[PDB]
Ligand binder design. Structure first.
Ligand code: NA
Ligand code: NA
Lengths: 246, 246
C-alpha cells in the first residue's frame, strides 16, 4: 500500500513574506482527511519561514538545487529541508536542463540524504508522433541507474504532460492514468516489481478541486504535483482526494 | 567625489545558517575607517537572516534576480533588499547569460527601484587578441541604453578580468586601472562627463588584504567586488582600503 502523496509547488509565489505567512496560517488550519504525505515547495527566500511556521506533519521542499546565484544541498540539508523537486518541465525546457545532468543531480541529491520529486514528461511533438511512451520510458530509463541501492524509498516520480501545458491541448483523466502506468511498467521491467509497487508516481498536469477526485481514483496515480492551486484554498481538497485512491 | 564602494559576494557560502550568523557577528564588530559604502551579497536562503541581523549601515544584496526554482524583484524588494548583482562572470559563462538579456534585466531591475552591480569583463581569447578594450566597451555600450533617465545614481559597474580567473594568468594593478579607465571613458563618450564622474567602477578580480591598498589608490578604481575574501577576516581590510583612494 503506497501512501498517497501531494506536493504543492508554489513556484515563484507569493509576492511577499506577509502573503506567505498568511498562506501558511491557512494551511496550518486545514483539516486533512485520510492518509496522505504532503510536501510544500517554495522559493528559496521563503524556506526559512516555512521551516519555522509550517505544520510539522508536512515537510518543506526546495524547487531545485545546485557559483554566484546558486544554492546547494548542505545549505538546505543544514536547514533541515529534506526534499527537492528535480527536472521540473519549466527548468528542463526554459533552461535546457538535460537528462544526464538531471540523473546526475538525482544521484548526488540522494547520496546526500535528500528525498526527490523527479519530474518527467513528453512535449507535443512526441505526443503527436505517437511516441509518448517511448519518450517517457527513455527518461525513466536514464533515471534508474542513478538511484543508489537502498534509496528508492526516497524517490517520487512526477509525470508532467508538457504537451498539454500552454499548447492549446488538454489531457484527459485516462491520459494521466496511462502515462503513470507506463512509468510503473518501466520500473517493473528494469528494477523489479518490489520497487515498482512502492514508488509513488504523481500526476503533474493541471490539478484542481474539480478534477482531483476523478484523477486520484486512477489505479496508477498515487498523488499530485500541484501548481497554481497550491496557493489557493482548494489545495486542501486536492490533499483530501486521497480518500478516492484505493 | 565618488564614495568608495565595496561589495562582498559570498557566492554559494557559507554552508550553514550557524556559520552565516557567526560571519555576521564578526562583520557587526568590524571597525570601518574612512568613508565607504558596503554591500553584502548572499545566497537567497540566507538573505532573511542578513536583513534581520546585519549592521544597518551596510546593505544586503541578491547575487542575481529573475517559473519553478526562480526568485523575483518584488520578493526581494518586498523583503527590503535594495541591491542585486547582475551579469556576474560565473553566470554569463556557465549559464550563457547574454548581453541583450542582461541589459534587459538591468532596465527591469532599475525600473522596479533596485540598485545594481552590473558586471562586465573579457575572456582570455579577446585579451590575447589585443581586443580587451573593444570587448568591454561593447558590453558597456549595450548596457548604457538600458539605464532609465535619473537612474545612474543606482548603478555601479564591476570589471571582472575573466581572462585571469582560472586560466593560469594574473592581472596586474595597472591592468585593473586601465580597464576601469576604459569603462569611464566609454561612459563619458556616450552619456557625458557628469555621469562618468559619478559612477563607481569596481575591480572584481582577485582582491585580498595584500593587494587592496595598492588597487584602491588607482584613480579610476572606486572599490571592489570581492569574492572569497568576503568570507574571511580580511574583508574589513578591503573595506578600509578606501583610505588610500584619493
Ligand atoms: Na490512485
Ligand atoms: Na581609487
Amino acid at each position: 500500500m503506497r501512501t498517497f502523496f501531494v506536493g504543492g509547488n508554489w513556484k515563484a509565489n507569493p509576492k511577499t513574506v506577509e502573503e506567505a505567512e498568511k498562506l501558511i496560517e491557512m494551511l496550518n488550519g486545514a483539516k486533512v482527511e485520510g492518509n496522505v504525505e504532503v510536501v510544500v515547495a517554495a522559493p528559496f527566500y521563503f524556506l526559512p519561514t516555512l521551516q519555522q511556521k509550517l505544520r510539522k506533519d508536512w515537510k518543506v521542499s526546495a524547487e531545485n538545487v545546485f557559483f554566484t546565484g546558486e544554492v546547494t544541498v548542505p545549505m538546505i540539508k543544514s536547514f533541515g529541508i529534506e526534499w527537492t523537486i528535480l527536472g521540473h518541465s519549466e527548468r528542463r525546457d526554459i533552461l535546457k536542463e538535460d537528462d544526464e545532468f538531471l540523473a546526475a543531480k538525482a544521484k548526488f541529491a540522494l547520496e546526500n540524504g535528500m528525498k526527490i520529486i523527479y519530474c518527467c514528461g513528453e512535449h507535443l511533438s512526441e505526443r503527436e508522433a505517437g511516441k509518448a511512451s517511448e519518450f517517457v520510458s527513455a527518461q525513466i530509463e536514464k533515471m534508474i541507474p542513478a538511484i543508489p541501492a537502498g534509496k528508492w524509498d526516497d524517490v517520487v516520480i512526477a509525470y508532467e504532460p508538457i504537451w498539454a501545458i500552454g499548447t492549446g491541448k488538454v489531457a484527459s483523466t485516462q491520459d494521466a492514468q496511462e502515462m503513470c502506468k507506463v512509468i510503473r511498467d518501466i520500473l517493473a521491467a528494469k528494477v523489479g516489481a518490489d520497487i515498482a509497487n512502492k514508488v509513488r508516481i504523481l500526476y503533474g498536469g493541471s490539478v484542481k478541486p474539480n478534477n482531483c477526485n476523478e484523477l486520484a481514483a486512477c489505479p496508477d496515480v498515487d498523488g499530485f504535483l500541484v501548481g497554481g492551486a497550491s496557493l489557493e484554498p482548494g489545495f486542501i481538497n486536492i490533499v483530501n482526494s486521497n480518500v478516492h485512491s484505493k
